[PDB]
Structure 1
Amino acid sequence: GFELSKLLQKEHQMRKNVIKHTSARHSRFGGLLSIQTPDKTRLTVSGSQALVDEKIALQKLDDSKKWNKRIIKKHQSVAAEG
């Protein structure tokens, strides 16, 4: 129970850091933000937590892309041997 209480404290701190990023309102509560670089441009992100801080908005703009690079895998050839 001692180690269990410490694991729940660690889980509570990680859950608090997760729900910092979580929007306070619901999902359909639509918030659109236009960020500009000092080179004048308009980039639109959709979120409520990303409205206030720049880093969550830039993490959204990084995460909104659907193209992923190839990561080659060794395919775990150790299991082929007995």
Structure 2
Amino acid sequence: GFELSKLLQKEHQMRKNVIKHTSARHSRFGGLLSIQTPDKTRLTVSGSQALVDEKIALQKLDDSKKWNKRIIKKHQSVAAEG
């Protein structure tokens, strides 16, 4: 029981840290942000957290990107060597 309570508290802290990334209003509220680069060009982001925070805005900008660089992993089946 003591370990279960400690783990529940750990999960509670993790959820609390996660909460800052969630919007109080529903998804379809529809807030649009415009962020100004050092040069006079504006980028568009969506979400309340984007308007209220900047680090969240850049994280979303990053996250929204589609292109992924290939990662090749050298996997050896243990059953192959017996």
Fold-level similarity (TM above 0.5): yes
- How far 1:76 sits from its partner (Å)? 3.0
- Measured in 2, the distance between the counterparts of 1:6 and 1:22 equals 25
Q: How high is the TM-score relative to the length of structure 2?
A: 0.93
Change (3 A) 1:6 1:41: same
**What runs of 5+ residues in structure 2 fail to find an aligned partner?**
none
Q: How high is the TM-score relative to the length of structure 1?
A: 0.93
* Identical columns (%): 100
- Measured in 2, the distance between the counterparts of 1:48 and 1:31 equals 6
- How far 1:20 sits from its partner (Å)? 1.1
Partner of 1:19: 19
**What runs of 5+ residues in structure 1 fail to find an aligned partner?**
none
- How far 1:38 sits from its partner (Å)? 1.7
1:25-75 CA distance string (max 9 Å, x none):
101011110001121101000111111110001000000011111011112
- How far 1:19 sits from its partner (Å)? 1.0
- How far 1:78 sits from its partner (Å)? 3.4
- Measured in 1, the distance between the counterparts of 2:23 and 2:77 equals 44
